[PDB]
Amino acid sequence: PFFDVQKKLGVDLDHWMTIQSAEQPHRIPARCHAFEKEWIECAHGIGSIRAEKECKIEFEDFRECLLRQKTMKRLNAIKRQRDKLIKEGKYTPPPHHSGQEDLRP
Amino acid sequence: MWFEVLPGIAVMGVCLFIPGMATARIHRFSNGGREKRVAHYSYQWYLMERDRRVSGVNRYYVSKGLENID
Amino acid sequence: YPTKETAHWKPPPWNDVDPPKSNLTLNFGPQHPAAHGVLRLVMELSG
Amino acid sequence: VAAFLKNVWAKEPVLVASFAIAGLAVILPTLSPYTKYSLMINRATPYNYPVPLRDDGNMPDVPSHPQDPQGPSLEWLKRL
Amino acid sequence: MMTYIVFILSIIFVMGFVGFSSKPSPIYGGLGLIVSGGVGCGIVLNFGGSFLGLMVFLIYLGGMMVVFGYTTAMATEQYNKVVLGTFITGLLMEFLMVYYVLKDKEVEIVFKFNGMGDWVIYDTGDSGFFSEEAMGIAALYSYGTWLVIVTGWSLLIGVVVIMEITRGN
Amino acid sequence: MNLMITLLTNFTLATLLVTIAFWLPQLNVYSEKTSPRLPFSMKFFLVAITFLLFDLEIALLLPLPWASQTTNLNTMLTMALLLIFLLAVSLAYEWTQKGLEWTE
Amino acid sequence: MFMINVLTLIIPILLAVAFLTLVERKVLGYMQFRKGPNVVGPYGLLQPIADAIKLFIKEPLRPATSSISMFILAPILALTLALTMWIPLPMPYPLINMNLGVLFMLAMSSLAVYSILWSGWASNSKYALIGALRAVAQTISYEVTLAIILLSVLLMNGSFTLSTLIITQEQVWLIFPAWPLAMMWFISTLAETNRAPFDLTEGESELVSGFNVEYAAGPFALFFMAEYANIIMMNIFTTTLFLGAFHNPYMPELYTINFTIKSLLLSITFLWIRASYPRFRYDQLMHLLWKNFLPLTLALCMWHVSLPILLSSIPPQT
Amino acid sequence: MSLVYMNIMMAFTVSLTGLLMYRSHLMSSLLCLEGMMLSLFILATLMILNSHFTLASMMPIILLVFAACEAALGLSLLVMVSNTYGTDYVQNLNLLQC
Amino acid sequence: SRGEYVVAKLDDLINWARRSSLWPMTFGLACCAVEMMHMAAPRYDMDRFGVVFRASPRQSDVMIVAGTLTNKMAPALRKVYDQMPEPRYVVSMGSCANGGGYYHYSYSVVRGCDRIVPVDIYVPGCPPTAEALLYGILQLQKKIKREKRLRIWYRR
Ligand SMILES: CCCCCCCCCCCCCCCCCC(=O)OC[C@H](COP(=O)([O-])OCC[N+](C)(C)C)OC(=O)CCCCCCCCCCCCCCCCC
Ligand SMILES: CCCCCCCCCCCCCCCCCC(=O)OC[C@H](COP(=O)(O)OCCN)OC(=O)CCCCCCCCCCCCCCCCC
Ligand SMILES: CCCCCCCCCCCCCCCCCC(=O)OC[C@H](COP(=O)(O)OCCN)OC(=O)CCCCCCCCCCCCCCCCC
Ligand SMILES: CCCCCCCCCCCCCCCCCC(=O)OC[C@H](COP(=O)(O)OCCN)OC(=O)CCCCCCCCCCCCCCCCC
Ligand SMILES: CCCCCCCCCCCCCCCCCC(=O)OC[C@H](COP(=O)(O)OCCN)OC(=O)CCCCCCCCCCCCCCCCC
Ligand SMILES: CCCCCCCCCCC1=C(C)C(=O)C(OC)=C(OC)C1=O
Ligand code: SF4
């Protein structure tokens, strides 16, 4: 019983808060605006069953944009290997990762 | 008579005068003889952190003018 | 079907209304005892 | 409408002032000449960046510079 | 320690929920939920939700828990084992979760979770001359017409509903 | 961080003054002094719930100084006056059905 | 250096609270055709020191409490809130210059009733709890008009920033476009702090303030000084909010002397109202709120919503 | 994912099991319910601020308003129960077993 | 020596703070209440000595028994005395609180409030005038001034 009264009357009651790529106040972009736009423009019109398999890559990029789990796992690997090399003494941090270089701009 | 309350009102007024004058003089002492930078919005903090980086001495209130460019 | 456990269950009332199954009494005194100071009052307050 | 109003201004002047202030607040922007200028000032306040346009060759109403004559002007805002 | 400030506030938040959820009394339950609302409000304030944190203080702690304590003063009379045991049970479970996620930097109770501080996942951009959260809340009036209609209608119906059911007739 | 230092200083000064006012009058060793449900009111609870409901209506009214800055001013003015009108109608229904009685 | 600024805020707060007791007793003395204290110090200036040393060594009262921890936390919370209501106050510069200092003060003053409610829970009297409930209902009642009047005034400000509210009033005092909001604000802040004619705990119209009654209460000096910090604070907040003074950016002491003189006159106006009127009955100030102030406050809230749109006078956000 | 989301979810489940295991009082049940709402508020706010998704900033306000009106309705039910029985104990509310 | 000097100055400080900040609790029993109300009136004005008017019965320093103590209000007098925090003091004002007075031989009158409470200052009169009661209050302050609490503590 999804009585789509909004599309029948042509009124907009709640389609504006629905996605991040909608018309935002003062044109503020969301952090995953491009990824959600790619996933929506992929998955539009082809239905859920074709959208789960034919738009899997845009959906994975958008989920990894939102949650950043692969990015945090990569940073965990880099930080853990860096701390292991500090513990093994085979690595010294550079002057630009120590606070002694007077940043760019 | 009625002016006998004025020593107590004077002491209470000095006690109200101390915090604002104190924070004005502390903001001038802590920021190079000037007002504290008001950063309510992220653009103002962006410019303030740019000032902190371009001063070289890690202070936003050290202003670099036309003497810094060639 | 009554059991050993559900033996204490009486049937509910007919109009589903159960019987409901007081007011405050205050000893009073004047606040600062300079004007009256020797007054005692026993109240029956209703809120 | 005249005797009832004087009677309620005698009895409950707080509520008469309340409904008068509320009624003027409702009906006065529909009769105000300055309500348009609120809209005009709020849309002329540049919170974002005016992202430029690729000049394909024929856009005569879009300027090439801020100080060019064509473009939406704010002489009404300075003058009023 | 200071980089993990939102995590420390979240652990204090979980400890407060264990504190009142064990339910020693409605009075101390209200106290524990007040302290929990304060530290969870601090969690919200440290991401940039200043208006939403002050909505916690002004509305949640300022009105609703005041009304809960007001009603608790009119319900119970002023003057254990299961409460304190469940409290130390929840405290042991939470510190075992903390020790696991700090020694392993990856834990899976229901979902996977990072072991570093949550400072990593922020954005490196600026918003300009506005708070984005403030402008999105300001958009309740221009964009959220239907939302304001249904919320105000629900509050007016709530007034009518409370006057109907507390009348007793 | 300046705010947290200020709050910690204020809470510490409050706790210090409470510790003084509970332990300083114990220094003078006094004598050992030996000689030796509340009625529920519906109106108190109703004024508390009336506060809570109108405070939720205030919570809806709180983004108005930011909402004046919008470009959809007809919609914004309509919904602002509509929320204050719903707060007024809530007060009118609280009036006329004898809800504001003996705590008027 | 910042801790020096915090101490130069919060210790002169306590000294100003100490001498507000002297100013109150003297001004209520001369308004009652008598004198206030003039024996204890030169012109009575050592009266607050003597009275504080007296109260800090007077015995804990007679009884014990229902809840010990809330009996400890109610003065701690009262003093903490009464000292943290000052930190966004721009005078001409605030200590913590926060973007939402108005909303911060309204929220921390909404938190202030827990000291009343926990002191009611802490005392063993079932009648002092009723009095605490009446005081809580009074305070949360007038918080409604505090919030809506404050919102209606900030519709001419543009933001919740308290420092912007000095910039707003550079051409005119904001009491001139908003004097009905100012007078309802002044009476509502008078009714927030349980101040006469609205002081029903410290007066009659009370079921427990009754001469050989129970209820262990805390050290009276701490609730008293938190109350007077609230009084001086709400008068400075009213001064910043309506009677905001001239500010020279190169001479801050001009604005500091100016808001100090206005805040002293407004606190003396509190002292001059409490020595002029009898007390309300409890239902009479409930009537004064819910059937007198709140209709006018909603009417003026609609008026100050729709008025900058019909005058094209919408203040800027920044 | 984010480490603070684990703690806010575990807080929701702690207040859930507090609400799903009554001791004596209905007021403690409503406190556990509003602790659940508090954890929902915090978790929704942290997501919406994290995403910089602008129009959902008004969503936690709607959650807070609707669920505090829900809480006022629950306190009125508690008041009617306490006016009936004298306490807010859950074992007095067992007339409907038969 | 040194410690005797320190406890002497501390006694001087606390006796100054107690006598210069007396808070009276009045028993308005009888006609002497009217004369205490004149002792608080603008002519004599107890409040300029730090002696406040209409203090809380909970926190108060001196109980002023101003009137006739009958047999029906002796336990109320003693219970209000026992609820007072130490140091509590008693000023007996007028002849009926002193020794029964004009109703000394009555069946219903306690013959002096000193049968009920320990009395510090006896203020005689029927009524003793507002100036005479203020004299009794200043004599009570002189009695508080020469207390040796910490000196006797250091010497015990
Ligand atoms: C901030 C700086 C200071 C501000 C001013 C405050 C200082 C002065 C303080 C004086 C001492 C007050 C002590 C406390 C008194 C409490 C009692 C009291 O006053 O109750 C309030 C009384 C209460 O009413 P009442 O009790 O007098 O009347 C009886 C009421 N009935 C019948 C319901 C029982 O009045 C108000 O509520 C008025 C509030 C302010 C009104 C503002 C008026 C604005 C009018 C605008 C024009 C309207 C005309 C129509 C529209 C025209 C449009 C073009
Ligand atoms: C922002 C500003 C805040 C200011 C707050 C304070 C306001 C009031 C300031 C003080 C006003 C004047 C005080 C005068 C007090 C009386 C002094 C005096 O004469 O004391 C006499 C007494 C006995 O002396 P004796 O030797 O017996 O004399 C007989 C001689 N033929 O001798 C004594 O009692 C001993 C000496 C006591 C001296 C006490 C002085 C006052 C102390 C008040 C505490 C706070 C002071 C301010 C601190 C910050 C500023 C420095
Ligand atoms: C249209 C714009 C929007 C309007 C809505 C917004 C209103 C803002 C103010 C909020 C007010 C909230 C509460 C309103 C309740 C009104 C009903 C009411 O109070 O009726 C009862 C009252 C008699 O009171 P009583 O029962 O005796 O109680 C004891 C009090 N002494 O009865 C009365 O006192 C009679 C009150 C009705 C007559 C008032 C007439 C006022 C006319 C003013 C001039 C015209 C203004 C234009 C708009 C008119 C709208 C009616
Ligand atoms: C019974 C328990 C004990 C009771 C006594 C003690 C507690 C009660 C009295 C103290 C209340 C503490 C309130 C702490 C938060 C106050 C709100 C707040 O932070 O507002 C200020 C500001 C928001 O404004 P804005 O300018 O937008 O932000 C900076 C952007 N440039 O935001 C900022 O500046 C953000 C600064 C960093 C975040 C600060 C968070 C503080 C730590 C968490 C809360 C700790 C208190 C917990 C208890 C609260 C009350 C229950
Ligand atoms: C080893 C040495 C040091 C040892 C530790 C002691 C440190 C200092 C302690 C305070 C001073 C001790 C002496 C106290 C006063 C002694 C003299 C005295 O009693 O003088 C009486 C005189 C008034 O005379 P009186 O008889 O009352 O007058 C009748 C009316 N004409 O009184 C006066 O004229 C005024 C008396 C004022 C007393 C001093 C001022 C108050 C105390 C200030 C510091 C403590 C308070 C700090 C802040 C508290 C909160 C604000
Ligand atoms: C930290 C400083 C503490 C100073 C304490 C001063 C106490 C005020 C004394 C007079 C007084 C006033 C004005 C007063 O208003 C009051 O409440 C009715 C009292 O209690 C009965 C008082 O005793
Ligand atoms: S001593 Fe005399 S004048 Fe005084 S109260 Fe007694 S009867 Fe009255």
mmCIF file with all atom_site columns, N, CA and C and ligand atoms in Angstrom, chain G residues 39-40 46 48-49 52-53, chain I residues 5-6 9-10 12-13 16 19 145, ligand 5:
data_model
loop_
_atom_site.group_PDB
_atom_site.id
_atom_site.type_symbol
_atom_site.label_atom_id
_atom_site.label_alt_id
_atom_site.label_comp_id
_atom_site.label_asym_id
_atom_site.label_entity_id
_atom_site.label_seq_id
_atom_site.pdbx_PDB_ins_code
_atom_site.Cartn_x
_atom_site.Cartn_y
_atom_site.Cartn_z
_atom_site.occupancy
_atom_site.B_iso_or_equiv
_atom_site.pdbx_formal_charge
_atom_site.auth_seq_id
_atom_site.auth_comp_id
_atom_site.auth_asym_id
_atom_site.auth_atom_id
_atom_site.pdbx_PDB_model_num
ATOM   1  N N   . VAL G 1 39  ? 27.861 49.707 61.060 1.00 0.00 ? 39  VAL G N   1
ATOM   2  C CA  . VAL G 1 39  ? 28.642 49.541 62.276 1.00 0.00 ? 39  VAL G CA  1
ATOM   3  C C   . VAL G 1 39  ? 29.790 48.565 62.073 1.00 0.00 ? 39  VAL G C   1
ATOM   4  N N   . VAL G 1 40  ? 29.543 47.499 61.311 1.00 0.00 ? 40  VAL G N   1
ATOM   5  C CA  . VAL G 1 40  ? 30.469 46.374 61.238 1.00 0.00 ? 40  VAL G CA  1
ATOM   6  C C   . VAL G 1 40  ? 31.740 46.756 60.486 1.00 0.00 ? 40  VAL G C   1
ATOM   7  N N   . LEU G 1 46  ? 32.491 45.868 55.995 1.00 0.00 ? 46  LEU G N   1
ATOM   8  C CA  . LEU G 1 46  ? 32.918 44.574 56.513 1.00 0.00 ? 46  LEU G CA  1
ATOM   9  C C   . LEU G 1 46  ? 31.749 43.706 56.951 1.00 0.00 ? 46  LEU G C   1
ATOM   10 N N   . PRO G 1 48  ? 29.679 41.918 54.739 1.00 0.00 ? 48  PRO G N   1
ATOM   11 C CA  . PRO G 1 48  ? 29.666 40.612 54.054 1.00 0.00 ? 48  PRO G CA  1
ATOM   12 C C   . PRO G 1 48  ? 30.752 39.658 54.510 1.00 0.00 ? 48  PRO G C   1
ATOM   13 N N   . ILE G 1 49  ? 31.927 40.172 54.879 1.00 0.00 ? 49  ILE G N   1
ATOM   14 C CA  . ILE G 1 49  ? 33.010 39.318 55.353 1.00 0.00 ? 49  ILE G CA  1
ATOM   15 C C   . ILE G 1 49  ? 32.640 38.684 56.688 1.00 0.00 ? 49  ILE G C   1
ATOM   16 N N   . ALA G 1 52  ? 29.848 36.091 56.100 1.00 0.00 ? 52  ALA G N   1
ATOM   17 C CA  . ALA G 1 52  ? 30.308 34.863 55.463 1.00 0.00 ? 52  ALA G CA  1
ATOM   18 C C   . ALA G 1 52  ? 31.116 34.002 56.424 1.00 0.00 ? 52  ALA G C   1
ATOM   19 N N   . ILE G 1 53  ? 31.939 34.629 57.274 1.00 0.00 ? 53  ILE G N   1
ATOM   20 C CA  . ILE G 1 53  ? 32.660 33.859 58.285 1.00 0.00 ? 53  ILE G CA  1
ATOM   21 C C   . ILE G 1 53  ? 31.688 33.296 59.316 1.00 0.00 ? 53  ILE G C   1
ATOM   22 N N   . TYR I 2 5   ? 49.144 33.008 70.745 1.00 0.00 ? 5   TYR I N   1
ATOM   23 C CA  . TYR I 2 5   ? 48.827 34.212 69.984 1.00 0.00 ? 5   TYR I CA  1
ATOM   24 C C   . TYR I 2 5   ? 47.928 33.898 68.795 1.00 0.00 ? 5   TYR I C   1
ATOM   25 N N   . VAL I 2 6   ? 48.176 32.771 68.126 1.00 0.00 ? 6   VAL I N   1
ATOM   26 C CA  . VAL I 2 6   ? 47.379 32.402 66.959 1.00 0.00 ? 6   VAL I CA  1
ATOM   27 C C   . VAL I 2 6   ? 45.950 32.054 67.363 1.00 0.00 ? 6   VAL I C   1
ATOM   28 N N   . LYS I 2 9   ? 44.116 35.332 68.280 1.00 0.00 ? 9   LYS I N   1
ATOM   29 C CA  . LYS I 2 9   ? 43.640 36.098 67.132 1.00 0.00 ? 9   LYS I CA  1
ATOM   30 C C   . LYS I 2 9   ? 42.520 35.376 66.392 1.00 0.00 ? 9   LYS I C   1
ATOM   31 N N   . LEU I 2 10  ? 42.525 34.041 66.392 1.00 0.00 ? 10  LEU I N   1
ATOM   32 C CA  . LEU I 2 10  ? 41.426 33.310 65.771 1.00 0.00 ? 10  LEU I CA  1
ATOM   33 C C   . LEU I 2 10  ? 40.143 33.427 66.582 1.00 0.00 ? 10  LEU I C   1
ATOM   34 N N   . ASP I 2 12  ? 39.475 36.100 68.342 1.00 0.00 ? 12  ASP I N   1
ATOM   35 C CA  . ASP I 2 12  ? 39.053 37.468 68.058 1.00 0.00 ? 12  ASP I CA  1
ATOM   36 C C   . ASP I 2 12  ? 38.325 37.563 66.723 1.00 0.00 ? 12  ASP I C   1
ATOM   37 N N   . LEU I 2 13  ? 38.820 36.848 65.708 1.00 0.00 ? 13  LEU I N   1
ATOM   38 C CA  . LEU I 2 13  ? 38.172 36.845 64.398 1.00 0.00 ? 13  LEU I CA  1
ATOM   39 C C   . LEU I 2 13  ? 36.790 36.200 64.446 1.00 0.00 ? 13  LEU I C   1
ATOM   40 N N   . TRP I 2 16  ? 34.350 38.326 66.465 1.00 0.00 ? 16  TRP I N   1
ATOM   41 C CA  . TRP I 2 16  ? 33.934 39.473 65.665 1.00 0.00 ? 16  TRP I CA  1
ATOM   42 C C   . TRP I 2 16  ? 32.880 39.078 64.646 1.00 0.00 ? 16  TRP I C   1
ATOM   43 N N   . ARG I 2 19  ? 29.490 38.181 66.671 1.00 0.00 ? 19  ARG I N   1
ATOM   44 C CA  . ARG I 2 19  ? 28.735 39.260 67.291 1.00 0.00 ? 19  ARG I CA  1
ATOM   45 C C   . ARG I 2 19  ? 28.347 40.342 66.298 1.00 0.00 ? 19  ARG I C   1
ATOM   46 N N   . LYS I 2 145 ? 31.910 38.790 72.615 1.00 0.00 ? 145 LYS I N   1
ATOM   47 C CA  . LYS I 2 145 ? 33.245 39.305 72.316 1.00 0.00 ? 145 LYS I CA  1
ATOM   48 C C   . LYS I 2 145 ? 34.302 38.725 73.248 1.00 0.00 ? 145 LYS I C   1
HETATM 49 C C1  . LIG J 3 .   ? 50.207 34.910 63.652 1.00 0.00 ? 5   LIG J C1  1
HETATM 50 C C2  . LIG J 3 .   ? 49.260 36.021 63.265 1.00 0.00 ? 5   LIG J C2  1
HETATM 51 C C3  . LIG J 3 .   ? 48.220 35.602 62.242 1.00 0.00 ? 5   LIG J C3  1
HETATM 52 C C4  . LIG J 3 .   ? 47.375 34.416 62.676 1.00 0.00 ? 5   LIG J C4  1
HETATM 53 C C5  . LIG J 3 .   ? 46.171 34.136 61.791 1.00 0.00 ? 5   LIG J C5  1
HETATM 54 C C6  . LIG J 3 .   ? 45.141 35.252 61.785 1.00 0.00 ? 5   LIG J C6  1
HETATM 55 C C7  . LIG J 3 .   ? 45.038 36.019 60.475 1.00 0.00 ? 5   LIG J C7  1
HETATM 56 C C8  . LIG J 3 .   ? 44.143 37.243 60.558 1.00 0.00 ? 5   LIG J C8  1
HETATM 57 C C9  . LIG J 3 .   ? 42.745 36.943 61.061 1.00 0.00 ? 5   LIG J C9  1
HETATM 58 C C10 . LIG J 3 .   ? 41.806 38.135 61.038 1.00 0.00 ? 5   LIG J C10 1
HETATM 59 C C11 . LIG J 3 .   ? 42.145 39.246 62.015 1.00 0.00 ? 5   LIG J C11 1
HETATM 60 C C12 . LIG J 3 .   ? 42.175 38.814 63.470 1.00 0.00 ? 5   LIG J C12 1
HETATM 61 C C13 . LIG J 3 .   ? 41.729 39.904 64.428 1.00 0.00 ? 5   LIG J C13 1
HETATM 62 C C14 . LIG J 3 .   ? 40.233 40.162 64.397 1.00 0.00 ? 5   LIG J C14 1
HETATM 63 C C15 . LIG J 3 .   ? 39.807 41.460 65.056 1.00 0.00 ? 5   LIG J C15 1
HETATM 64 C C16 . LIG J 3 .   ? 40.399 41.683 66.433 1.00 0.00 ? 5   LIG J C16 1
HETATM 65 C C17 . LIG J 3 .   ? 40.098 43.062 67.001 1.00 0.00 ? 5   LIG J C17 1
HETATM 66 C C18 . LIG J 3 .   ? 38.634 43.311 67.201 1.00 0.00 ? 5   LIG J C18 1
HETATM 67 O O1  . LIG J 3 .   ? 37.844 42.492 67.582 1.00 0.00 ? 5   LIG J O1  1
HETATM 68 O O2  . LIG J 3 .   ? 38.312 44.571 66.906 1.00 0.00 ? 5   LIG J O2  1
HETATM 69 C C19 . LIG J 3 .   ? 36.932 44.958 67.088 1.00 0.00 ? 5   LIG J C19 1
HETATM 70 C C20 . LIG J 3 .   ? 36.582 46.013 66.079 1.00 0.00 ? 5   LIG J C20 1
HETATM 71 C C21 . LIG J 3 .   ? 35.175 46.499 66.270 1.00 0.00 ? 5   LIG J C21 1
HETATM 72 O O3  . LIG J 3 .   ? 35.009 46.867 67.651 1.00 0.00 ? 5   LIG J O3  1
HETATM 73 P P1  . LIG J 3 .   ? 33.608 46.576 68.345 1.00 0.00 ? 5   LIG J P1  1
HETATM 74 O O4  . LIG J 3 .   ? 33.807 46.354 69.795 1.00 0.00 ? 5   LIG J O4  1
HETATM 75 O O5  . LIG J 3 .   ? 32.942 45.531 67.539 1.00 0.00 ? 5   LIG J O5  1
HETATM 76 O O6  . LIG J 3 .   ? 32.854 47.958 68.092 1.00 0.00 ? 5   LIG J O6  1
HETATM 77 C C22 . LIG J 3 .   ? 31.642 48.352 68.775 1.00 0.00 ? 5   LIG J C22 1
HETATM 78 C C23 . LIG J 3 .   ? 30.962 49.348 67.884 1.00 0.00 ? 5   LIG J C23 1
HETATM 79 N N1  . LIG J 3 .   ? 31.739 50.608 67.794 1.00 0.00 ? 5   LIG J N1  1
HETATM 80 O O7  . LIG J 3 .   ? 36.643 45.396 64.757 1.00 0.00 ? 5   LIG J O7  1
HETATM 81 C C24 . LIG J 3 .   ? 36.908 46.187 63.709 1.00 0.00 ? 5   LIG J C24 1
HETATM 82 O O8  . LIG J 3 .   ? 37.112 47.368 63.794 1.00 0.00 ? 5   LIG J O8  1
HETATM 83 C C25 . LIG J 3 .   ? 36.929 45.404 62.433 1.00 0.00 ? 5   LIG J C25 1
HETATM 84 C C26 . LIG J 3 .   ? 37.458 43.994 62.629 1.00 0.00 ? 5   LIG J C26 1
HETATM 85 C C27 . LIG J 3 .   ? 37.778 43.315 61.316 1.00 0.00 ? 5   LIG J C27 1
HETATM 86 C C28 . LIG J 3 .   ? 38.457 41.969 61.463 1.00 0.00 ? 5   LIG J C28 1
HETATM 87 C C29 . LIG J 3 .   ? 39.377 41.649 60.303 1.00 0.00 ? 5   LIG J C29 1
HETATM 88 C C30 . LIG J 3 .   ? 38.696 41.687 58.951 1.00 0.00 ? 5   LIG J C30 1
HETATM 89 C C31 . LIG J 3 .   ? 37.926 40.431 58.627 1.00 0.00 ? 5   LIG J C31 1
HETATM 90 C C32 . LIG J 3 .   ? 38.806 39.248 58.286 1.00 0.00 ? 5   LIG J C32 1
HETATM 91 C C33 . LIG J 3 .   ? 39.452 39.327 56.915 1.00 0.00 ? 5   LIG J C33 1
HETATM 92 C C34 . LIG J 3 .   ? 40.197 38.067 56.505 1.00 0.00 ? 5   LIG J C34 1
HETATM 93 C C35 . LIG J 3 .   ? 39.351 36.806 56.557 1.00 0.00 ? 5   LIG J C35 1
HETATM 94 C C36 . LIG J 3 .   ? 38.156 36.805 55.617 1.00 0.00 ? 5   LIG J C36 1
HETATM 95 C C37 . LIG J 3 .   ? 38.476 36.477 54.171 1.00 0.00 ? 5   LIG J C37 1
HETATM 96 C C38 . LIG J 3 .   ? 37.293 36.627 53.229 1.00 0.00 ? 5   LIG J C38 1
HETATM 97 C C39 . LIG J 3 .   ? 35.990 36.038 53.748 1.00 0.00 ? 5   LIG J C39 1
HETATM 98 C C40 . LIG J 3 .   ? 34.879 35.988 52.711 1.00 0.00 ? 5   LIG J C40 1
HETATM 99 C C41 . LIG J 3 .   ? 34.627 37.317 52.033 1.00 0.00 ? 5   LIG J C41 1
#
